[PDB]
């Protein structure tokens with residue numbers, strides 16, 4: 001199942017679901033429809049959902065995916081690099097993410113960049129920004145200036161998150177500064193999209209900071 005909702009103009013938020021030990025988690029990402037084709041950020045959470053996802057893209061827009069950008073090495077972000085490459089899309093990731101994928105023997109992106117990069121596709125513009133370590137050492141966010149949408153990915157927890165989620169590769173002591181960096185640089189954001197679960201509640205950044213503090217206080 002893939003849920004797709006228009007967020008602003010040609011920018012859409014898509015959500016897929018993956019159940020872990022009785023807890024049904026949602027993974028949120030976005031895709032942009034341009035005159036040159038569709039740009040997909042991250043990927044459906046689960047390989048058995050890739051075809052269903054692009055099938056929905058065709059049903060709704062009758063267009064082709066020409067680019068895929070992974071915001072970190074995990075399955076819900078970089079899991080589709082092989083698939084999107086196979087169907088003709090130009091794939092990207094940061095060099096740090098590439099190093100992690102290589103180490104884990106996971107498919108890698110065709111092109112890599114040094115943490116930050118500004119993109120221009122058709123008449124659309126967006127930028128990938130590295131705020132520092134948090135959920136992982138390589139996590140990046142994507143900013144769409146025209147739509148005023150900040151795709152936070154997993155460094156941003158949903159306002160209803162019970163805990164920080166998977167922290168086996170996290171840097172909790174650096175996470176607060178990284179989130180403060182995002183907040184300061186994209187202060188005028190109309191929409192901030194958390195990587196998991198409910199993203200609509202815009203207190204997501206506040207709750208994230210709350211969860212980090214809670215974790216640290218408990219030592």
Ligand SMILES: C[C@H](CS)C(=O)N1CCC[C@@H]1C(=O)O
Pocket residue numbers: 073074075076154166
């Ligand atoms: C929970 C994260 C996504 S934030 C996840 O999918 N992981 C963490 C380690 C195993 C799996 C993966 O990406 O390989």
Ligand code: NA
Pocket residue numbers: 101102103104105106107108
């Ligand atoms: Na590899």
Ligand SMILES: [Zn+2]
Pocket residue numbers: 072074135136154166
């Ligand atoms: Zn992750």
Ligand SMILES: [Zn+2]
Pocket residue numbers: 074076154195196
């Ligand atoms: Zn995630």
Ligand SMILES: [Zn+2]
Pocket residue numbers: 206207208210211
């Ligand atoms: Zn809170």
